[PDB]
Amino acid sequence: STNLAVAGSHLPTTQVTQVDIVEKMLAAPTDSTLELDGYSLNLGDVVSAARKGRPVRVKDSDEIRSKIDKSVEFLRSQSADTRTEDAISLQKALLEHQLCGVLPSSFDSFRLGRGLENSLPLEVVRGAMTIRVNSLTRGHSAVRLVVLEALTNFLNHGITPIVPLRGTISXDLSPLSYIAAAISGHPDSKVHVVHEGKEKILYAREAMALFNLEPVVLGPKEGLGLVNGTAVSASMATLALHDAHMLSLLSQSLTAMTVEAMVGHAGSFHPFLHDVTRPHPTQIEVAGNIRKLLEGSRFAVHHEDRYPLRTSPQWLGPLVSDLIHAHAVLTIEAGQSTTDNPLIDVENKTSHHGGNFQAAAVANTMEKTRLGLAQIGKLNFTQLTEMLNAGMNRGLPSCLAAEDPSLSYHCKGLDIAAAAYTSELGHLANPVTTHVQPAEMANQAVNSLALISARRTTESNDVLSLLLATHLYCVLQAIDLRAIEFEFKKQFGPAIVSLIDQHFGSAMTGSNLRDELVEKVNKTLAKRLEQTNSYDLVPRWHDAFSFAAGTVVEVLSSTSLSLAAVNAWKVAAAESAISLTRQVRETFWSAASTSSPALSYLSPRTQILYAFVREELGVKARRGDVFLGKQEVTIGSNVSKIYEAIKSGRINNVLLKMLA
Amino acid sequence: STNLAVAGTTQVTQVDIVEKMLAAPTDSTLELDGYSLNLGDVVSAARKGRPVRVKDSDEIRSKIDKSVEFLRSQDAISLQKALLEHQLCGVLPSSFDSFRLGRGLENSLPLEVVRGAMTIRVNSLTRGHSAVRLVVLEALTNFLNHGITPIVPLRGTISXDLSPLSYIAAAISGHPDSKVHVVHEGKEKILYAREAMALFNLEPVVLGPKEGLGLVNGTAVSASMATLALHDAHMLSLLSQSLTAMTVEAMVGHAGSFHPFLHDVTRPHPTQIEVAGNIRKLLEGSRFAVHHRQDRYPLRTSPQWLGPLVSDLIHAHAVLTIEAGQSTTDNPLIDVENKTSHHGGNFQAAAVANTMEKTRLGLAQIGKLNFTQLTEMLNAGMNRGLPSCLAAEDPSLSYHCKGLDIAAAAYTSELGHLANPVTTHVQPAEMANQAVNSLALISARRTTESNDVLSLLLATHLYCVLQAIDLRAIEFEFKKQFGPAIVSLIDQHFGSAMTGSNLRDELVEKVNKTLAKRLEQTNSYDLVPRWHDAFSFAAGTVVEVLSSTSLSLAAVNAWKVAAAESAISLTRQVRETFWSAASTSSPALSYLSPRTQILYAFVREELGVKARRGDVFLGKQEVTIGSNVSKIYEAIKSGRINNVLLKMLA
Amino acid sequence: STNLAVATQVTQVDIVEKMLAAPTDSTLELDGYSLNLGDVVSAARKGRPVRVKDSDEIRSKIDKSVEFLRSQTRTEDAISLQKALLEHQLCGVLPSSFDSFRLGRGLENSLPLEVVRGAMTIRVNSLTRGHSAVRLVVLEALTNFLNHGITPIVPLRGTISXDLSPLSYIAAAISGHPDSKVHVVHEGKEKILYAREAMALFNLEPVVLGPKEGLGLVNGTAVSASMATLALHDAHMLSLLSQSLTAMTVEAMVGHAGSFHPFLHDVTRPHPTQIEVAGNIRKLLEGSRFAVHQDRYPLRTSPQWLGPLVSDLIHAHAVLTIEAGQSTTDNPLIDVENKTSHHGGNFQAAAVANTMEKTRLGLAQIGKLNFTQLTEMLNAGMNRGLPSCLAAEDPSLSYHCKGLDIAAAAYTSELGHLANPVTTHVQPAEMANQAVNSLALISARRTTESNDVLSLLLATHLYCVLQAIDLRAIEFEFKKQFGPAIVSLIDQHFGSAMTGSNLRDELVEKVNKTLAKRLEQTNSYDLVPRWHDAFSFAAGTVVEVLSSTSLSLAAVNAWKVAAAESAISLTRQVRETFWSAASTSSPALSYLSPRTQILYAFVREELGVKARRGDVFLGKQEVTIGSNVSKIYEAIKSGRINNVLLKMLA
């Protein structure tokens, strides 16, 4: 509660990092019971309850039952018969106009893989029910414990009411009214449940009778004290932030891995450039994470780069600071705030009329986050597009094609997809909150529009997941293609000297030319090879040594070698390179993923992810159909596997393990 | 082709365009000739299953062969397989263990969009510019005609639309990983392309040289979804105009706002004239709308507000018929007659992206107009005397459309944020080789979402107006009996004291103006408190006009009470006869114009959604308001309401 | 540093107080770490003298960084690169001559003078950290320009905030480039002279950039940081004015000061800034005789609507002080102590653009909140009894603020459009080397415009709330005398017939009740009709309570006329005594809170903007409403209101 790791912070501060936060959340129990006491519920708890079917229950303690009883009792003392009679009517009337959202009318509209689009996702409504119960135990609304238990029972038995997707402007009555109608056994209330194997959608009553549950009878003001609030938009916002954090960390990881695949400089993350010269807390934090992932990497340079890599800390820094600030707002909103009205000050016999149902706080976190998500997207997109450009990837094959670029364009299609996702992310990033309409006959002239904003941010998390799944896929192919490059240099460096000595030397004897010749031939070779990375193997190498031969003509200018002698060497050298490269390739494709040469150069940290995608998810480097003479499983089928691992959360632990 | 009602100026209206479109056959086969296909046809083939095939005529077959031969006379199969290899990179679901109840195929493209895509694709390849053999075109029409639809990724195209079109070209060639959707013996299933071609005795095509590039090349996927989206945008535009007409009715507004002098004569913008005309036409005969004070902007500036959106919709139609029915968006293209190949950029779908951009803004504009009409009508202080939240009984325990008012606002907010342009977010795709790309498909998808959202909003507005006109009918049925009762009770209690004087007509005149003056700002009180309030004020004016009389305060008070009790009594009875008659003999049909009556019947009869009496009053929780609005929403998304709208405006 | 008030614990008021405490006389000494946002504003806008703090540690590490460079036709090839890197950066557009300078126009394509003075200050500050390797004689060149009032004329556009271009126009100026022009005031009368000319006038010597001096000098983001600071500064003022207007509106609306009670914030929704806002407003309302110690969202949800913005601003303050006061945004950067140079990206102004994006959005929300507060107050149907358009005389010939309500709407719409993000429009700059750029200056400019559009809105609100407060004061004075007059007239007309009954008390309670009930729906009538209408209705209840008395209809009518004529008579009287008194002795002073009275006085006395009686009523056309709103606006833009605000809230 006062740990900073479980509660983010406002203002920069170097006392709490995003990983500290992500660690806490992922440490939330899934088996143990979640006990709501109205003040200690944190975001990890909400996620665990909403997505990991964790058991929840109001904390067993008299203090809680006491305040809940003293509040009910207060709004009991306020003919007395008629004002109870009209109280019930007034709730019937509230539930009546509130149950007005659209949802499918039957099952004759449910096609395969379709059907519930206009329905709020199930995890969101479970998240809402958990937050609702938590705030009701504060004794500020005057609703009986047996009602809170009606909710906890639905939660523990897997009963999730079906609520409409649109309709609230987040001052979230309608959504909550559906929840209310479900536990009260409204006749037209349908819910979702998993009955011995398969999942169905029965009426409220019909589903409780399946578990021995009794619809609960409301009572005066018990209805207004239950639908009131903003638990639905807080729930979806929590889930979205949660995923946003993961995308953020996956982005920093992807940046380090891209540094390696690019043989970039780990020097742009040196603490002098951040901790000392531009002390923005999160910039320091981001620089530190990437600097940590790079330690021990034999792929990146450490001491003797384009913006997408060089300016990454100062580019993600501001986004992370906004996410940490959002996290401090959302914990206070989802675990300590009563968003109802009126609010009862029992120990003062008073009722306060205010506006804590105005979810601008939560709408605010979703606006920033959605924009931050577009920024992460631009960054990773540009890092990827540069890595796929042969004129910039510092020597990698044309489109990361393992074999001849003539009949292989491997990632070309993904370069276009990555541009399509980024574009979409941009349009999603415009603000929602500037489109506020004068609702309810001008009584609600200002409204937060939080749930709508959360929905948009949730879609951004989705598109960013496609973009980062595509980036991870590509950066992994690249790393293998570099590993193969390094295995080829290790042997060709010498082969160049052996040939130089074999063909010449006899003519260089007594001259002091062999060192000048070995150094100049290497330089012109590397100079030309850089802008030739899109040539087929055979022509690529005959081209390189043809330019090398031009150097020989100059340094050996006073020798007695014949043009035939040089051309002979040129042919031998190219033949050599060509053969040597085809052998190292076969060696790579013969080795199993567990013994990938790439493992010999990747830092200890980034190796963890390499393995996870190559071994656990079973996505392997692609050789190329036109080479294998067979059409293997599509690129898309493989990206989709990385994508599902992101959306499923399976990747979260491997991220945390490589940054801890 | 030359008909302005089939190919998008006062020489053609949106009604004409919609009429041609809804008149497309869904039974007879559609013969693709490469220059005749219109927007109606595409929809019919995409959504209605209407059979398609390339028009057998030799002239066509000749051009197709002469194109293919031209290429033969300038490895080849290796490049095609290389092309499909990198294009099959979209995200889809791994298996069927992620398919929960009602979910599953979200990252997949809608089946109707793909069928339309194959239809435009084929039509385009019959011009003999691509050089792809007829057998291939038929591989496509077969799939269509047998209900085979390839499962393609929803995202991954910047609409320069190779990726999706590569999923279609991998399905008719039986790619090993290609999946497709098909209805087999009642139920639906998704099985590998070869597995589905077997069950229909179909042969997986073998792509020859450059046939791969000729196939997967162009903007058929975007033009397809864009066409479906425009179609649905037209309907919403006409439904909005209808809602306007009905709203003016439930408001007892002026039909004079749509007089020809205000449009055809003073501000000659074609579509403004057009919209004013449509409404003036739906209002002819109405006893609700005044013919011969003031009306607010949502109704009075309606024509000059929708006019511009309409002109852009019409203009979008001209652009999309040319793009979907008379354009080959491939590259390279072959001249054949001049044995020349050309290199251009017809795959740059900027034309379709533009229609989708302005359409989406127009949909936001419509949403704002109808939302302001609705919210005004639900506002006690502005709805000209209609009951508080459109509650049939006492407003103290019934808030009928209060929630719906908030939902209208939510839908209108959503539409605003959707209206931002998508095309200003172009990225430097493919090593800066595609520095400028259209983003047409993405734009079309956003516009499709607006249509859906505007549909929720319009289904809500319609649910409300119907309830409003029924409430107004009641009021009318009441005034018919209470006008005389007032004069009767006035002659009973008074008149004996007015005898010989000239103040009876002055009294009746001032007591009617006092009531009307008060009843208008009291439409939120419960019945008995309301009437006693109304006559207590009226009592004040009698004290004045009968000032020289010899009446006693007890006398006037006795009249006031009697009058109020008579109003409460009458009102109760009129209400009771309304709920006793079947919607078929609703008093509303005696005041509704003959055209707006059509839509009234459709909803109350065919859809079966009736006026709501209450829930506290009936002592029973009936089908939720949401259940009824959803039925309307479904009638709109299904197209069922289209003919109804056409009958009204035609 | 370590104070928060300068960087829950710290509030916006604390922050604003520190900034306004910045010395505008005392020389501001730059040491590379102490510079704060208040300091920057003082140097940039108040002409405060600047100078590098004399210190051996400061000039030591500067010298040590220059000589580390020197140690590495090669001598002049270092100066040639400098002149080349200056040749291409001097590429923005400005007027080619003073022939295009019309009256009031001329420098639109130019960067604002205060923005460029702030940039030189921030630039000098970061150079004193010995990370760039720029001789002290160069820093002194810039501080001389600052201290002698010489300000380079730089292009408004051209930077994507990686801010080379504008910065190079400054470098050319202190180096005496032949084309470089500057602005300076020469013995009264401002002029634009060539850099050289100007330096002559003050005996200044143009610097001569050595090796790496140019690269170190034009590298960085001091221009963006500068405009952003100037904008955040004004944004803090505006949000405080917003909260003051909220309290004042609560008073004009006779609202409930209960919505700002600690239990509703400090206890139930513990958001730090929400508590803070609720506190400021609660603090402004203490002692008020207008607010009550049943309220729409604009006022009731005020703390939860403003809270989140204020938290963003405070976050932006922490970011900006670190960026402008203690950040080196050059590259490369030298680590003298270790004899190294690092290649990083501290020039990527993302942190700045970030604050400008959030602020622009919050400004839009402050706007919407005050526009809704204003529009409700000008709405006769919702302003709980205030005159039609805040007209001081009959509403039939006076619409006082009907024009301002439309304008407020116009400003609010503009702010909405301005609020969209700028940073999502990044283009692949310079070949592709600058693939990601911050666009900070552009974002800061848009934010500066929002500060200006919101200043128009709040100037309009403030004016209106002040006219409403006076109008409410007169209402209270009226009720003070009218209450007794009602009862007095009741006894005079019918006590003789109430004698021996227990009717008096019920009669007085009812008449008052109906007079209030009705009078709140007629605040748009013209006095004489308004009052006869109220008592006509009252006469209706007299008929009911005194139903058993022997009163004649004439006796009751007489009463009604006498009551109406005296209400009419009283109103005119209380009005005339209001307009006769001077602003210093206004009745509003009796009811206004001791703190809000402070802003009331400032506007009515210092600015001299009095309440308006009406042109038609005074038979004369006085200065226009606009001319007065303008004085309020100029008082806001000049910062003259800042101390007034601080005085109330502190």
mmCIF file of all heavy atoms in Angstrom, chain A residues 354-361, chain C residues 259-260 264-265 269 274 277-278 297 299-309:
data_model
loop_
_atom_site.group_PDB
_atom_site.id
_atom_site.type_symbol
_atom_site.label_atom_id
_atom_site.label_comp_id
_atom_site.label_asym_id
_atom_site.label_seq_id
_atom_site.Cartn_x
_atom_site.Cartn_y
_atom_site.Cartn_z
ATOM 1 N N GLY A 354 -21.955 14.293 -3.885
ATOM 2 C CA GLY A 354 -20.815 14.771 -4.650
ATOM 3 C C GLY A 354 -20.764 14.223 -6.062
ATOM 4 O O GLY A 354 -21.793 14.080 -6.720
ATOM 5 N N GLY A 355 -19.569 13.907 -6.542
ATOM 6 C CA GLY A 355 -19.479 13.386 -7.887
ATOM 7 C C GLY A 355 -18.364 12.404 -8.136
ATOM 8 O O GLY A 355 -17.714 12.479 -9.168
ATOM 9 N N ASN A 356 -18.135 11.465 -7.230
ATOM 10 C CA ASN A 356 -17.053 10.518 -7.453
ATOM 11 C C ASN A 356 -17.359 9.473 -8.517
ATOM 12 O O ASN A 356 -16.617 8.506 -8.650
ATOM 13 C CB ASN A 356 -16.647 9.828 -6.147
ATOM 14 C CG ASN A 356 -16.101 10.799 -5.132
ATOM 15 O OD1 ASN A 356 -15.371 11.687 -5.559
ATOM 16 N ND2 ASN A 356 -16.420 10.654 -3.852
ATOM 17 N N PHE A 357 -18.439 9.665 -9.265
ATOM 18 C CA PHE A 357 -18.799 8.738 -10.333
ATOM 19 C C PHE A 357 -18.257 9.287 -11.652
ATOM 20 O O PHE A 357 -18.387 8.624 -12.683
ATOM 21 C CB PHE A 357 -20.319 8.591 -10.417
ATOM 22 C CG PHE A 357 -21.031 9.894 -10.393
ATOM 23 C CD1 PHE A 357 -21.110 10.675 -11.536
ATOM 24 C CD2 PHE A 357 -21.535 10.396 -9.200
ATOM 25 C CE1 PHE A 357 -21.678 11.945 -11.492
ATOM 26 C CE2 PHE A 357 -22.100 11.660 -9.144
ATOM 27 C CZ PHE A 357 -22.172 12.439 -10.295
ATOM 28 N N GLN A 358 -17.663 10.482 -11.614
ATOM 29 C CA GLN A 358 -17.086 11.109 -12.808
ATOM 30 C C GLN A 358 -15.685 10.527 -13.076
ATOM 31 O O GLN A 358 -14.688 11.118 -12.682
ATOM 32 C CB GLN A 358 -16.992 12.631 -12.596
ATOM 33 C CG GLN A 358 -16.620 13.479 -13.841
ATOM 34 C CD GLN A 358 -17.708 13.508 -14.906
ATOM 35 O OE1 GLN A 358 -17.712 12.593 -15.716
ATOM 36 N NE2 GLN A 358 -18.592 14.489 -14.907
ATOM 37 N N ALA A 359 -15.625 9.386 -13.758
ATOM 38 C CA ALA A 359 -14.370 8.677 -14.060
ATOM 39 C C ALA A 359 -13.299 9.370 -14.934
ATOM 40 O O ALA A 359 -12.623 8.675 -15.702
ATOM 41 C CB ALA A 359 -14.712 7.301 -14.671
ATOM 42 N N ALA A 360 -13.122 10.685 -14.811
ATOM 43 C CA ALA A 360 -12.126 11.397 -15.610
ATOM 44 C C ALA A 360 -10.715 10.913 -15.310
ATOM 45 O O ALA A 360 -9.861 10.896 -16.202
ATOM 46 C CB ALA A 360 -12.225 12.883 -15.372
ATOM 47 N N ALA A 361 -10.473 10.518 -14.066
ATOM 48 C CA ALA A 361 -9.167 10.011 -13.671
ATOM 49 C C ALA A 361 -8.792 8.816 -14.531
ATOM 50 O O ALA A 361 -7.733 8.813 -15.154
ATOM 51 C CB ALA A 361 -9.178 9.608 -12.200
ATOM 52 N N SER C 259 -20.433 20.060 -2.070
ATOM 53 C CA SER C 259 -19.792 19.172 -3.034
ATOM 54 C C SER C 259 -18.276 19.171 -2.836
ATOM 55 O O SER C 259 -17.583 18.268 -3.316
ATOM 56 C CB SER C 259 -20.103 19.609 -4.464
ATOM 57 O OG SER C 259 -21.089 20.623 -4.484
ATOM 58 N N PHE C 260 -17.772 20.172 -2.117
ATOM 59 C CA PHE C 260 -16.338 20.285 -1.889
ATOM 60 C C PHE C 260 -15.944 19.951 -0.467
ATOM 61 O O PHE C 260 -14.945 20.461 0.034
ATOM 62 C CB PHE C 260 -15.869 21.696 -2.233
ATOM 63 C CG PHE C 260 -16.480 22.239 -3.487
ATOM 64 C CD1 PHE C 260 -17.615 23.045 -3.431
ATOM 65 C CD2 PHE C 260 -15.958 21.907 -4.728
ATOM 66 C CE1 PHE C 260 -18.219 23.510 -4.601
ATOM 67 C CE2 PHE C 260 -16.552 22.366 -5.899
ATOM 68 C CZ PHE C 260 -17.682 23.167 -5.836
ATOM 69 N N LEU C 264 -15.968 13.791 0.841
ATOM 70 C CA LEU C 264 -16.179 13.429 -0.553
ATOM 71 C C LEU C 264 -14.892 13.365 -1.372
ATOM 72 O O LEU C 264 -14.940 13.037 -2.554
ATOM 73 C CB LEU C 264 -17.152 14.413 -1.203
ATOM 74 C CG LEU C 264 -18.635 14.268 -0.826
ATOM 75 C CD1 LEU C 264 -19.438 15.454 -1.378
ATOM 76 C CD2 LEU C 264 -19.170 12.929 -1.360
ATOM 77 N N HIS C 265 -13.753 13.654 -0.756
ATOM 78 C CA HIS C 265 -12.500 13.628 -1.487
ATOM 79 C C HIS C 265 -11.415 12.995 -0.632
ATOM 80 O O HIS C 265 -10.949 11.883 -0.893
ATOM 81 C CB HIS C 265 -12.097 15.060 -1.866
ATOM 82 C CG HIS C 265 -13.182 15.832 -2.556
ATOM 83 N ND1 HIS C 265 -13.481 15.670 -3.892
ATOM 84 C CD2 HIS C 265 -14.077 16.730 -2.078
ATOM 85 C CE1 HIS C 265 -14.513 16.433 -4.206
ATOM 86 N NE2 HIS C 265 -14.894 17.085 -3.122
ATOM 87 N N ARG C 269 -12.423 9.370 -2.111
ATOM 88 C CA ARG C 269 -11.745 9.250 -3.408
ATOM 89 C C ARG C 269 -10.425 10.026 -3.260
ATOM 90 O O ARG C 269 -10.203 11.065 -3.886
ATOM 91 C CB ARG C 269 -12.642 9.869 -4.495
ATOM 92 C CG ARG C 269 -12.314 9.551 -5.967
ATOM 93 C CD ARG C 269 -13.395 10.190 -6.856
ATOM 94 N NE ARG C 269 -13.084 10.313 -8.284
ATOM 95 C CZ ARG C 269 -12.726 9.298 -9.062
ATOM 96 N NH1 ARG C 269 -12.623 8.086 -8.546
ATOM 97 N NH2 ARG C 269 -12.498 9.490 -10.354
ATOM 98 N N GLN C 274 -7.252 15.803 -6.695
ATOM 99 C CA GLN C 274 -8.697 16.021 -6.530
ATOM 100 C C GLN C 274 -8.919 16.667 -5.153
ATOM 101 O O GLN C 274 -9.725 17.586 -4.981
ATOM 102 C CB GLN C 274 -9.470 14.701 -6.589
ATOM 103 C CG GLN C 274 -10.971 14.891 -6.590
ATOM 104 C CD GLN C 274 -11.734 13.586 -6.507
ATOM 105 O OE1 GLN C 274 -11.399 12.695 -7.292
ATOM 106 N NE2 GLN C 274 -12.715 13.462 -5.621
ATOM 107 N N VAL C 277 -7.802 20.296 -5.482
ATOM 108 C CA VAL C 277 -8.758 21.181 -6.127
ATOM 109 C C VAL C 277 -9.909 21.430 -5.176
ATOM 110 O O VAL C 277 -10.194 22.575 -4.867
ATOM 111 C CB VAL C 277 -9.284 20.591 -7.443
ATOM 112 C CG1 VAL C 277 -10.382 21.487 -8.029
ATOM 113 C CG2 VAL C 277 -8.125 20.451 -8.430
ATOM 114 N N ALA C 278 -10.537 20.364 -4.697
ATOM 115 C CA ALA C 278 -11.659 20.472 -3.779
ATOM 116 C C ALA C 278 -11.291 21.402 -2.639
ATOM 117 O O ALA C 278 -12.132 22.155 -2.146
ATOM 118 C CB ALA C 278 -12.017 19.107 -3.243
ATOM 119 N N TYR C 297 -23.580 18.566 -12.799
ATOM 120 C CA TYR C 297 -22.208 18.118 -13.001
ATOM 121 C C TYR C 297 -21.109 19.168 -13.121
ATOM 122 O O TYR C 297 -20.055 19.008 -12.510
ATOM 123 C CB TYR C 297 -22.150 17.203 -14.219
ATOM 124 C CG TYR C 297 -22.763 15.839 -14.000
ATOM 125 C CD1 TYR C 297 -23.664 15.610 -12.956
ATOM 126 C CD2 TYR C 297 -22.475 14.785 -14.869
ATOM 127 C CE1 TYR C 297 -24.265 14.365 -12.787
ATOM 128 C CE2 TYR C 297 -23.070 13.537 -14.713
ATOM 129 C CZ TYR C 297 -23.963 13.332 -13.671
ATOM 130 O OH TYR C 297 -24.536 12.091 -13.512
ATOM 131 N N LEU C 299 -20.598 21.888 -11.731
ATOM 132 C CA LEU C 299 -20.144 22.363 -10.434
ATOM 133 C C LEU C 299 -19.844 21.217 -9.479
ATOM 134 O O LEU C 299 -18.802 21.210 -8.825
ATOM 135 C CB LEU C 299 -21.189 23.279 -9.795
ATOM 136 C CG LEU C 299 -21.484 24.614 -10.480
ATOM 137 C CD1 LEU C 299 -22.572 25.350 -9.704
ATOM 138 C CD2 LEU C 299 -20.217 25.447 -10.547
ATOM 139 N N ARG C 300 -20.750 20.248 -9.415
ATOM 140 C CA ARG C 300 -20.591 19.125 -8.511
ATOM 141 C C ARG C 300 -19.452 18.183 -8.855
ATOM 142 O O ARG C 300 -18.820 17.683 -7.932
ATOM 143 C CB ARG C 300 -21.885 18.318 -8.417
ATOM 144 C CG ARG C 300 -22.159 17.776 -7.022
ATOM 145 C CD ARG C 300 -23.076 16.569 -7.050
ATOM 146 N NE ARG C 300 -24.227 16.753 -7.932
ATOM 147 C CZ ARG C 300 -24.860 15.747 -8.531
ATOM 148 N NH1 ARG C 300 -24.453 14.498 -8.342
ATOM 149 N NH2 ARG C 300 -25.891 15.981 -9.327
ATOM 150 N N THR C 301 -19.190 17.927 -10.132
ATOM 151 C CA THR C 301 -18.108 17.014 -10.480
ATOM 152 C C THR C 301 -16.821 17.759 -10.799
ATOM 153 O O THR C 301 -15.857 17.172 -11.303
ATOM 154 C CB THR C 301 -18.463 16.118 -11.691
ATOM 155 O OG1 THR C 301 -18.678 16.935 -12.851
ATOM 156 C CG2 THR C 301 -19.692 15.292 -11.394
ATOM 157 N N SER C 302 -16.823 19.049 -10.495
ATOM 158 C CA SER C 302 -15.694 19.937 -10.716
ATOM 159 C C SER C 302 -14.326 19.427 -10.233
ATOM 160 O O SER C 302 -13.341 19.493 -10.970
ATOM 161 C CB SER C 302 -16.002 21.278 -10.056
ATOM 162 O OG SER C 302 -14.819 22.017 -9.899
ATOM 163 N N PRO C 303 -14.235 18.934 -8.989
ATOM 164 C CA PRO C 303 -12.939 18.442 -8.513
ATOM 165 C C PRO C 303 -12.454 17.178 -9.205
ATOM 166 O O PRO C 303 -11.253 17.016 -9.457
ATOM 167 C CB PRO C 303 -13.184 18.215 -7.029
ATOM 168 C CG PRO C 303 -14.116 19.312 -6.702
ATOM 169 C CD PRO C 303 -15.112 19.231 -7.846
ATOM 170 N N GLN C 304 -13.375 16.269 -9.502
ATOM 171 C CA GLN C 304 -12.976 15.040 -10.151
ATOM 172 C C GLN C 304 -12.717 15.219 -11.651
ATOM 173 O O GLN C 304 -12.160 14.338 -12.291
ATOM 174 C CB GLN C 304 -14.006 13.930 -9.880
ATOM 175 C CG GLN C 304 -15.443 14.385 -9.634
ATOM 176 C CD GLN C 304 -15.688 14.911 -8.219
ATOM 177 O OE1 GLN C 304 -15.755 16.129 -8.085
ATOM 178 N NE2 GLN C 304 -15.814 14.051 -7.214
ATOM 179 N N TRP C 305 -13.100 16.371 -12.195
ATOM 180 C CA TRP C 305 -12.884 16.662 -13.608
ATOM 181 C C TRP C 305 -11.548 17.398 -13.789
ATOM 182 O O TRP C 305 -10.788 17.115 -14.720
ATOM 183 C CB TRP C 305 -14.035 17.511 -14.151
ATOM 184 C CG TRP C 305 -13.966 17.742 -15.650
ATOM 185 C CD1 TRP C 305 -13.354 18.781 -16.295
ATOM 186 C CD2 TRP C 305 -14.501 16.894 -16.679
ATOM 187 N NE1 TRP C 305 -13.474 18.631 -17.655
ATOM 188 C CE2 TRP C 305 -14.172 17.486 -17.921
ATOM 189 C CE3 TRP C 305 -15.222 15.689 -16.670
ATOM 190 C CZ2 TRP C 305 -14.538 16.916 -19.149
ATOM 191 C CZ3 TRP C 305 -15.587 15.116 -17.894
ATOM 192 C CH2 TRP C 305 -15.241 15.734 -19.120
ATOM 193 N N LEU C 306 -11.264 18.337 -12.887
ATOM 194 C CA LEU C 306 -10.014 19.103 -12.929
ATOM 195 C C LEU C 306 -8.817 18.344 -12.321
ATOM 196 O O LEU C 306 -7.688 18.458 -12.811
ATOM 197 C CB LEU C 306 -10.204 20.426 -12.195
ATOM 198 C CG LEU C 306 -11.138 21.419 -12.875
ATOM 199 C CD1 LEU C 306 -11.466 22.567 -11.941
ATOM 200 C CD2 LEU C 306 -10.469 21.917 -14.130
ATOM 201 N N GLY C 307 -9.081 17.570 -11.269
ATOM 202 C CA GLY C 307 -8.045 16.811 -10.600
ATOM 203 C C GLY C 307 -7.010 16.197 -11.514
ATOM 204 O O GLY C 307 -5.823 16.520 -11.408
ATOM 205 N N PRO C 308 -7.425 15.304 -12.422
ATOM 206 C CA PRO C 308 -6.519 14.637 -13.369
ATOM 207 C C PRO C 308 -5.659 15.575 -14.238
ATOM 208 O O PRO C 308 -4.513 15.222 -14.501
ATOM 209 C CB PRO C 308 -7.466 13.759 -14.189
ATOM 210 C CG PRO C 308 -8.550 13.418 -13.188
ATOM 211 C CD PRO C 308 -8.792 14.759 -12.525
ATOM 212 N N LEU C 309 -6.185 16.723 -14.674
ATOM 213 C CA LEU C 309 -5.411 17.678 -15.492
ATOM 214 C C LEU C 309 -4.256 18.236 -14.644
ATOM 215 O O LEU C 309 -3.074 18.239 -15.031
ATOM 216 C CB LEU C 309 -6.272 18.879 -15.908
ATOM 217 C CG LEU C 309 -7.475 18.740 -16.826
ATOM 218 C CD1 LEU C 309 -8.159 17.388 -16.628
ATOM 219 C CD2 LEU C 309 -8.423 19.881 -16.532
#
